[PDB]
Write a protein that binds this ligand. Structure first.
Ligand SMILES: CC(=O)NCCc1ccc(S(N)(=O)=O)cc1
Ligand SMILES: CC(=O)NCCc1ccc(S(N)(=O)=O)cc1
Ligand SMILES: [Cl-]
Ligand SMILES: [Zn+2]
Length: 259
């Protein structure tokens, strides 16, 4: 059974024993060296089209919480930039720290942010998410950094429901949530080929990491940190530090959409 996690006994340094691609050639996350990233005029405009996004449910899966979408039609899609074709939004989730000084997966000139949002999309040419993750261009994940400062009003409905999904396996109805409230003003980004950042660590992702962070309040991220990795009735293990550290860049280039 799956027994990977974020603890000393089952965390990222152990994953390779059950998921040997952990030591692969295109693993994520990575440190983004902003001086070495090169502007690419070939990149087409990024198109985030969430007007018809249809959220359904929020789930504590024991690793993070996912806000799930109806992906049975092209209701919410990502296109353009480095992408060929249409990628459909399936879910978003976050990674975050025990303290404001850590929590992000990607880093920017080695800087760690308090958290990182991942909007996960699958390439419609593969029909379903399960098939998409077996393809090198199966997924596009839009990553957005969170820093602690002013509150993000568009996040508060998420924070408000966390009380109801404290433990692993709990879910709650979560309809009519607009993910556009989680974006920064600018769509300026970095992009590179990588992987899922949790087991199974599949090398199927085109990463698109926005340069501009969003600000959330200390009180908002403190509520993330009250979640539990454990199930109901088990010893409490706060859901904190659910991030994988930066992995070797190997033979990759990070491209910038700007400057
Ligand atoms: C729950 C616990 O700590 N189990 C220890 C054994 C255990 C550690 C790591 C993994 S892996 N390679 O999938 O990350 C599986 C099992
Ligand atoms: C069945 C299956 O492979 N599910 C993978 C779920 C999964 C989706 C996205 C990510 S991340 N943090 O890279 O955005 C990790 C895991
Ligand atoms: Cl794959
Ligand atoms: Zn993630």
């Amino acid at each position: 059974s799956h027994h990977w996690g974020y603890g000393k006994h089952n965390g990222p340094e152990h994953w390779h024993k059950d998921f040997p691609i952990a030591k692969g050639e295109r693993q994520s996350p990575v440190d983004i060296d902003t001086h070495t990233a090169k502007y690419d005029p070939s990149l087409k405009p990024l198109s985030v089209s969430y007007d018809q996004a249809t959220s359904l449910r929020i789930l504590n899966n024991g690793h993070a919480f996912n806000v799930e979408f109806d992906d049975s039609q092209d209701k919410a899609v990502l296109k353009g930039g480095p992408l060929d074709g249409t990628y459909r939004l399936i879910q978003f989730h976050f990674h975050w720290g025990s303290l404001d000084g850590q929590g992000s997966e990607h880093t920017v000139d080695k800087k760690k942010y308090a958290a990182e949002l991942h909007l996960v999309h699958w390439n419609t040419k593969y029909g379903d998410f399960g098939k998409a993750v077996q393809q090198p261009d199966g997924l596009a994940v839009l990553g957005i950094f969170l820093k602690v400062g002013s509150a993000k009003p568009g996040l508060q409905k998420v924070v408000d429901v966390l009380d109801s999904i404290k433990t692993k396996g709990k879910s709650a109805d979560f309809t009519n949530f607009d993910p556009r409230g989680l974006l920064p003003e600018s769509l300026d980004y970095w992009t590179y080929p990588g992987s899922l950042t949790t087991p199974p660590l599949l090398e199927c992702v085109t990463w698109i990491v926005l340069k501009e962070p969003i600000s959330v309040s200390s009180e908002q991220v403190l509520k993330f940190r009250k979640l539990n990795f454990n199930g109901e009735g088990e010893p409490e293990e706060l859901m904190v530090d659910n991030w994988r550290p930066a992995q070797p860049l190997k033979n990759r280039q990070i491209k910038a959409s700007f400057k």
